[PDB]
Write a protein that binds this DNA or RNA. Structure first.
Ligand SMILES: [Mg+2]
Ligand SMILES: [Mg+2]
Ligand SMILES: [Mg+2]
Ligand SMILES: [Mg+2]
Ligand SMILES: [Mg+2]
Ligand SMILES: [Mg+2]
Ligand SMILES: [Mg+2]
Ligand SMILES: [Mg+2]
Ligand SMILES: [Mg+2]
Ligand SMILES: [Mg+2]
Ligand SMILES: [Mg+2]
Ligand SMILES: [Mg+2]
Ligand SMILES: [Mg+2]
Ligand SMILES: [Mg+2]
Ligand SMILES: [Mg+2]
Ligand SMILES: [Mg+2]
Ligand SMILES: [Mg+2]
Ligand SMILES: [Mg+2]
Ligand SMILES: [Mg+2]
Ligand SMILES: [Mg+2]
Ligand SMILES: [Mg+2]
Ligand SMILES: [Mg+2]
Ligand SMILES: [Mg+2]
Ligand SMILES: [Mg+2]
Ligand SMILES: [Mg+2]
Ligand SMILES: [Mg+2]
Ligand SMILES: [Mg+2]
Ligand SMILES: [Mg+2]
Ligand SMILES: [Mg+2]
Ligand SMILES: [Mg+2]
Ligand SMILES: [Mg+2]
Ligand SMILES: [Mg+2]
Ligand SMILES: [Mg+2]
Ligand SMILES: [Mg+2]
Ligand SMILES: [Mg+2]
Ligand SMILES: [Mg+2]
Ligand SMILES: [Mg+2]
Ligand SMILES: [Mg+2]
Ligand SMILES: [Mg+2]
Ligand SMILES: [Mg+2]
Ligand SMILES: [Mg+2]
Ligand SMILES: [Mg+2]
Ligand SMILES: [Mg+2]
Ligand SMILES: [Mg+2]
Ligand SMILES: [Mg+2]
Ligand SMILES: [Mg+2]
Ligand SMILES: [Mg+2]
Ligand SMILES: [Mg+2]
Ligand SMILES: [Mg+2]
Ligand SMILES: [Mg+2]
Ligand SMILES: [Mg+2]
Ligand SMILES: [Mg+2]
Ligand SMILES: [Mg+2]
Ligand SMILES: [Mg+2]
Ligand SMILES: [Mg+2]
Ligand SMILES: [Mg+2]
Ligand SMILES: [Mg+2]
Ligand SMILES: [Mg+2]
Ligand SMILES: [Mg+2]
Ligand SMILES: [Mg+2]
Ligand SMILES: [Mg+2]
Ligand SMILES: [Mg+2]
Ligand SMILES: [Mg+2]
Ligand SMILES: [Mg+2]
Ligand SMILES: [Mg+2]
Ligand SMILES: [Mg+2]
Ligand SMILES: [Mg+2]
Ligand SMILES: [Mg+2]
Ligand SMILES: [Mg+2]
Ligand SMILES: [Mg+2]
Ligand SMILES: [Mg+2]
Ligand SMILES: [Mg+2]
Ligand SMILES: [Mg+2]
Ligand SMILES: [Mg+2]
Ligand SMILES: [Mg+2]
Ligand SMILES: [Mg+2]
Ligand SMILES: [Mg+2]
Ligand SMILES: [Mg+2]
Ligand SMILES: [Mg+2]
Ligand SMILES: [Mg+2]
Ligand SMILES: [Mg+2]
Ligand SMILES: [Mg+2]
Ligand SMILES: [Mg+2]
Ligand SMILES: [Mg+2]
Ligand SMILES: [Mg+2]
Ligand SMILES: [Mg+2]
Ligand SMILES: [Mg+2]
Ligand SMILES: [Mg+2]
Ligand SMILES: [Mg+2]
Ligand SMILES: [Mg+2]
Ligand SMILES: [Mg+2]
Ligand SMILES: [Mg+2]
Ligand SMILES: [Mg+2]
Ligand SMILES: [Mg+2]
Ligand SMILES: [Mg+2]
Ligand SMILES: [Mg+2]
Ligand SMILES: [Mg+2]
Ligand SMILES: [Mg+2]
Ligand SMILES: [Mg+2]
Ligand SMILES: [Mg+2]
Ligand SMILES: [Mg+2]
Ligand SMILES: [Mg+2]
Ligand SMILES: [Mg+2]
Ligand SMILES: [Mg+2]
Ligand SMILES: [Mg+2]
Ligand SMILES: [Mg+2]
Ligand SMILES: [Mg+2]
Ligand SMILES: [Mg+2]
Ligand SMILES: [Mg+2]
Ligand SMILES: [Mg+2]
Ligand SMILES: [Mg+2]
Ligand SMILES: [Mg+2]
Ligand SMILES: [Mg+2]
Ligand SMILES: [Mg+2]
Ligand SMILES: [Mg+2]
Ligand SMILES: [Mg+2]
Ligand SMILES: [Mg+2]
Ligand SMILES: [Mg+2]
Ligand SMILES: [Mg+2]
Ligand SMILES: [Mg+2]
Ligand SMILES: [Mg+2]
Ligand SMILES: [Mg+2]
Ligand SMILES: [Mg+2]
Ligand SMILES: [Mg+2]
Ligand SMILES: [Mg+2]
Ligand SMILES: [Mg+2]
Ligand SMILES: [Mg+2]
Ligand SMILES: [Mg+2]
Lengths: 275, 46
RNA sequence: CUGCUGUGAAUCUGCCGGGACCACCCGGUAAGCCUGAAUACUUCCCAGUGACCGAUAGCGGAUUAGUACCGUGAGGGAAU
RNA sequence: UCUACCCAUGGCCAGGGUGAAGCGCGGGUAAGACCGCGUGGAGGCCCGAACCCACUUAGGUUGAAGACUGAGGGGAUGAG
RNA sequence: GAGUGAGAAUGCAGGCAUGAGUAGCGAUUAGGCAAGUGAGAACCUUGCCCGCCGAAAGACCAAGGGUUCCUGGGCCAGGCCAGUCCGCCCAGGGUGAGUCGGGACCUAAGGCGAGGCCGACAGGCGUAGUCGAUGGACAACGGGUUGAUAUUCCCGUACCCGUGUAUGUGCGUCCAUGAUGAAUCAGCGGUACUAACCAUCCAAAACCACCGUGACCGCACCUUUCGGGGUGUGGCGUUGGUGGGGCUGCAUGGGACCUUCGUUGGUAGUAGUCAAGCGAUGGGGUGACGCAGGAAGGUAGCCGUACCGGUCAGUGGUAAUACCGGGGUAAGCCUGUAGGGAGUCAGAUAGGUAAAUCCGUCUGGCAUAUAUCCUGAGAGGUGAUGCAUAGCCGAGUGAGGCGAAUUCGGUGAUCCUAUGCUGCCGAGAAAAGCCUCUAGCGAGGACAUACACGGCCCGUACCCCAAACCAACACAGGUGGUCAGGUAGAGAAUACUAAGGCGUACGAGUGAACUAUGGUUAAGGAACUCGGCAAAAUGCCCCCGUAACUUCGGGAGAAGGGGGACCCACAUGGCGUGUAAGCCUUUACGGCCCAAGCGUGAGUGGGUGGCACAAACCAGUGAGAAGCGACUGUUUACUAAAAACACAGGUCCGUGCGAAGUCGCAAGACGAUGUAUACGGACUGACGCCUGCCCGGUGCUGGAAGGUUAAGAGGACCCG
RNA sequence: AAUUCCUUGUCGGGUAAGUUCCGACCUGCACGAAUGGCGUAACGACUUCUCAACUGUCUCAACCAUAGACUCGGCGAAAU
């Protein structure tokens, strides 16, 4: 849920925070954590490639089984539901009855003690993971693959999901959270149900410092640059840019997808733009 | 009242930025060392 | 004459060149390879020479000289 | 090696106020709302040294100093 | 034959004038006298005063420096003066480690990077690796000693790694002893990866019917009758769209013919395996981590005291009644308190690269255990008949010898328990080390005793908020960490002080103007000025009391008013602490309670003194409006701190994923170990009410019947 | 009006005296709706106007001390 902050300070005036209500434990699993450091938005040349990335609280990586492919038919009751700095969604520690612990993205309404099962014969209780071939055409699914074996890539951010519209031959036509309709090989693996933590987008971050705790740095805008730094800079007084809007490197607004991409045969409809 | 001047000595850092091994690993550095040897410097490098 | 790309033959009544090109004449024999001498230079060594300088000159350096010193560093750089 | 930003790993932040949610008690409510009381210890909270800045002014202005000094000045658990 | 002629190039070098015996001689502490030394003394040595620092201007380090350290000598240069002195010159000397700080241990960011991939070459990245502390692991403390080192030397007592020898328990390879789990012969019941088989998702080639034609036309046909055009049905014909049928064809899941897995009558726990010990480079656990906030229990430290040793400080009193000084001692080894943490036993089981008796998981039986285990401040003992100390002495250059008492309390941490506990979201390194399990190695081996030994390399002197480092200088600037006495005090502020350290390197005079820095100022009180600039003013604690407005948090310390000293009494009071005395019990390193002893506010009443009682130093001026930006923040190092930037909130656009964007020639990287509630770009800028018109221009996006258009195919016709 | 040249626009307030200021008027040279428009509690070393208090800012300056200046001894420059 969301809990609001009392305006005791100008920095808390409209801010709100999450009710970490599904968070059943406040400490991760030790054997599933890897070291993770901060990169500053800088690539192998040491140079800034993505701007506005730095500072930010230290975080550690949790290993998620995005590739839930080896535990077929082996149940796993949910051990804990816990926080993750690297997602918007929470994570669930699964206790496979063979004696093996893993992490998955927690779906909406997942509880402790819930049996989760995998394989073609798995039922369609949310949490269960099985190939697109076996889910009825009309389920709402999350964390679906692009190629049969590559692990989840689609609809894994918090609160989102994919509607499986139908199946034709060896392809499944299913709509992205973006409204796009795409076709994916029916041999791909998917998990049933929406993603939890759906309210996380309703929260006011309050102050510049709170968004700096997240690894985000201030964004200066071109109209207040000089013409040597941005196409939008220059002029005396405030300007609208004196020019059609462009990126820092001169590029104009417009379509940016690479034409004639090999996957362009797999997109039924693109996404809507503002109606 | 800031009065910090530009040179702050550090023997290790001076070695790791100007030393013999760093001049040698690259190519322009070997050029610099050979040039200084030919000129006659008693100290080729830091 | 020659590089990259495409196309792409003949073995001598062949093929190439003779300033677009063609005919005739003439010269030669590609797509295989070696090759001394006559030619260019001087880190270094030896021996000499100068209508060359003679200590603010001549080498930056006749003496602690690429030294002292200046610079983070490439480097700059004396005076005696 | 100054400075700008970032990355890892460490250290520091006298003293004193305020009194958030949460919990508990009572009242009030068909049931609430809410209030009063306590515990509670929040906050780019307050006053204020170390520390970090640099708003005013006077002096300096072949200086003590190629940007300082004196008197006041802002931040001071945090985008420090 | 010329390097052939200088007065000018803000010309180049050297030597020297003018200003001129002029300015300055580098803080905000401050010196004096007596004596000595010496050729010479304001500056050196010694004594006695005075003053300054004292969260330092004291003590100890890192980085950096490099011999500046000590002794002897020196006095030409340097020292902003002189110098007998010196961080200066000269010579000799000085730095001692198993435990300190590093390496021989481990890794982080990162660096380099066998092969490698990429790139015309030069090269770019990078795997395995290997370095790389600012972090993790790891064993020593007190006292003494030199002119110069000191957990290093010595003394006393420890701890940690190896090594050899002799002895003791004592499991063992062999015997032998147990545990032992089997298999074959053959009787079997399902469990089977193996046809054929079934269900599921999709459509193999496929018709029907409703409704339309992408264009042609026959049309209900309409419009100035027919100009143009066109709402609408039909056939040639499909941009063809939609709802229907089951065999059927593909894939997905399932039992089953197939095999195999389990069962036993007898032979055959025969044969083999386990039962000492070390055990990984492999598996596992731990290592192992944030921020804030207490409270409690402690100790250090400090303040008094029993006891001890002494003083008489030429003053009016003060001989013990007063005053001054002591009122000490570590690691280690014992004990295991306050606190904090933790179920136990057995069975089965690939999940952990193989195996696990280890770890996970699932089952079950027990009592919530003042039990038990672990941890752990501290108290206590021992260390310690030792060491140290106030003093006392002969007796001096001073080397030396002797040496008392040490008991109770109060206060009290920013230090410890504590890598704890509780809250919170922003969700908080790795590796070795250690422990553990098996793989394995194995005939010996484990613990103990005593004696004898080995413990490597580098630093260590000295400075270190500074005349020894960075600043050209013996420079008013800069420089990370540790320690933190007293009295006022909330305080690490401020005033004064202790220990300790300084008086720091031109002086001596002198009532000029003028400048600077402080002070006071009659009457007036902003009349000054661009402007209350600068000064002045308020300032503390406790009670009382506080406005418009509000986003209900604030505004607010709003504004405003009263008190504050000292003595006495209430008061042998209250409160904290806590000994005895006592009470209570698991009986102890127990709890309860408390005379005494100590510490300590608050008021109440009475009195007393002064111009003044927050007496010094320290320490908000307040109120009312308007503009801008909501807010805290950031910014032109060195004339601009702002209304400018940022911001939380808003929208628009792009991006379906080695995304888009960016860095690269590429490979590759960031984005992101993210996946549209995400990421990038653009504008706006908390909040509240809203955001009008214009799509012509220019961009963006989309579309195609036409017009136009490259290279490439074509080679009619013409020319040699 | 951080926007108005004309302009010291007009009316009221405020002063003894008001080109700034506040509240309005509309003739908007040359405001206007995310280069947002209009408000807004809290905040500001921001800009502007005012009152109280306070004062050497001033009428109008006087006096005191210290560091220089000044004199004596030592050393001893500079731009020009
Ligand atoms: Mg690099
Ligand atoms: Mg961004
Ligand atoms: Mg999250
Ligand atoms: Mg939001
Ligand atoms: Mg806010
Ligand atoms: Mg934004
Ligand atoms: Mg911005
Ligand atoms: Mg620009
Ligand atoms: Mg441009
Ligand atoms: Mg501009
Ligand atoms: Mg403008
Ligand atoms: Mg400065
Ligand atoms: Mg050849
Ligand atoms: Mg010469
Ligand atoms: Mg001569
Ligand atoms: Mg020369
Ligand atoms: Mg040098
Ligand atoms: Mg509270
Ligand atoms: Mg409460
Ligand atoms: Mg604050
Ligand atoms: Mg403030
Ligand atoms: Mg403050
Ligand atoms: Mg202040
Ligand atoms: Mg301050
Ligand atoms: Mg700054
Ligand atoms: Mg100013
Ligand atoms: Mg002057
Ligand atoms: Mg001066
Ligand atoms: Mg100043
Ligand atoms: Mg100051
Ligand atoms: Mg000449
Ligand atoms: Mg001349
Ligand atoms: Mg001349
Ligand atoms: Mg000259
Ligand atoms: Mg002269
Ligand atoms: Mg003169
Ligand atoms: Mg004069
Ligand atoms: Mg003078
Ligand atoms: Mg001086
Ligand atoms: Mg004398
Ligand atoms: Mg003092
Ligand atoms: Mg003190
Ligand atoms: Mg000191
Ligand atoms: Mg000395
Ligand atoms: Mg001398
Ligand atoms: Mg001298
Ligand atoms: Mg001497
Ligand atoms: Mg000496
Ligand atoms: Mg040893
Ligand atoms: Mg590495
Ligand atoms: Mg190589
Ligand atoms: Mg590399
Ligand atoms: Mg190493
Ligand atoms: Mg270290
Ligand atoms: Mg010493
Ligand atoms: Mg010692
Ligand atoms: Mg961890
Ligand atoms: Mg805490
Ligand atoms: Mg305590
Ligand atoms: Mg007397
Ligand atoms: Mg005493
Ligand atoms: Mg187990
Ligand atoms: Mg003890
Ligand atoms: Mg050394
Ligand atoms: Mg030493
Ligand atoms: Mg030392
Ligand atoms: Mg040091
Ligand atoms: Mg000095
Ligand atoms: Mg120096
Ligand atoms: Mg200094
Ligand atoms: Mg500092
Ligand atoms: Mg004190
Ligand atoms: Mg002080
Ligand atoms: Mg003293
Ligand atoms: Mg005079
Ligand atoms: Mg004055
Ligand atoms: Mg007066
Ligand atoms: Mg008066
Ligand atoms: Mg006034
Ligand atoms: Mg006036
Ligand atoms: Mg006035
Ligand atoms: Mg006037
Ligand atoms: Mg002022
Ligand atoms: Mg004042
Ligand atoms: Mg009030
Ligand atoms: Mg107000
Ligand atoms: Mg008040
Ligand atoms: Mg008792
Ligand atoms: Mg009793
Ligand atoms: Mg009792
Ligand atoms: Mg009186
Ligand atoms: Mg104050
Ligand atoms: Mg207004
Ligand atoms: Mg604003
Ligand atoms: Mg602002
Ligand atoms: Mg500036
Ligand atoms: Mg400011
Ligand atoms: Mg300024
Ligand atoms: Mg700006
Ligand atoms: Mg936004
Ligand atoms: Mg836009
Ligand atoms: Mg791309
Ligand atoms: Mg979007
Ligand atoms: Mg703006
Ligand atoms: Mg808005
Ligand atoms: Mg609009
Ligand atoms: Mg429009
Ligand atoms: Mg338009
Ligand atoms: Mg348009
Ligand atoms: Mg258009
Ligand atoms: Mg277009
Ligand atoms: Mg062609
Ligand atoms: Mg105005
Ligand atoms: Mg205007
Ligand atoms: Mg006007
Ligand atoms: Mg008027
Ligand atoms: Mg007005
Ligand atoms: Mg704009
Ligand atoms: Mg505008
Ligand atoms: Mg607009
Ligand atoms: Mg705005
Ligand atoms: Mg406005
Ligand atoms: Mg406002
Ligand atoms: Mg501010
Ligand atoms: Mg300002
Ligand atoms: Mg007069
Ligand atoms: Mg003077
Ligand atoms: Mg003189």
């Amino acid at each position: 849920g969301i809990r609001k902050y009392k305006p005791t300070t100008p920095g808390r005036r409209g801010a709100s925070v999450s009710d970490f209500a599904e968070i059943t434990r406040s400490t991760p699993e030790k054997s599933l954590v890897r070291p993770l450091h901060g990169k500053g938005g800088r690539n192998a040349h040491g140079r800034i490639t993505t701007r506005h990335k730095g500072g930010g609280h230290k975080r550690a990586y949790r290993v998620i089984d995005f590739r839930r492919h080896d535990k077929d038919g082996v149940n796993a009751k949910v051990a804990h539901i816990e926080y993750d700095p690297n997602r918007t969604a929470n994570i669930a520690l699964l206790h496979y009855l063979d004696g093996e612990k893993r992490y998955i993205i927690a779906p909406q309404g997942l509880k402790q003690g819930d049996v989760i099962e995998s394989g073609a014969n798995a039922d369609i209780k949310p949490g269960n993971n099985l190939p697109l071939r076996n889910i009825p055409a009309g389920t709402v699914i999350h964390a679906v693959e692009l190629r049969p074996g590559g692990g989840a890539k689609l609809a894994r951010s918090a609160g989102v999901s994919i509607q499986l519209l139908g199946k034709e031959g060896t392809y499944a036509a299913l709509r992205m959270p973006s409204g796009e309709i795409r076709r994916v090989d029916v041999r791909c693996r998917a998990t049933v149900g929406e993603v939890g933590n759906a309210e996380q987008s309703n929260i006011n971050w309050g102050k510049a410092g709170r968004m700096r705790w997240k690894g985000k740095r201030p964004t200066v805008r071109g109209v207040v640059m000089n013409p040597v730094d941005h196409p939008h800079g220059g002029g005396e007084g405030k300007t609208s840019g004196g020019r059609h809007p462009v990126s820092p490197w001169g590029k104009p607004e417009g379509r940016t997808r690479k034409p004639n991409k090999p996957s362009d045969k797999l997109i039924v409809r693109r996404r809507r733009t503002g109606k | 009242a800031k009065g910090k001047r530009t040179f702050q000595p550090n023997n290790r850092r001076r070695a790791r930025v100007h030393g013999f091994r760093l001049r040698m690993r690259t190519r322009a550095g070997r050029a610099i060392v050979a040039n200084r040897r030919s000129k006659g410097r008693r100290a080729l490098t830091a």
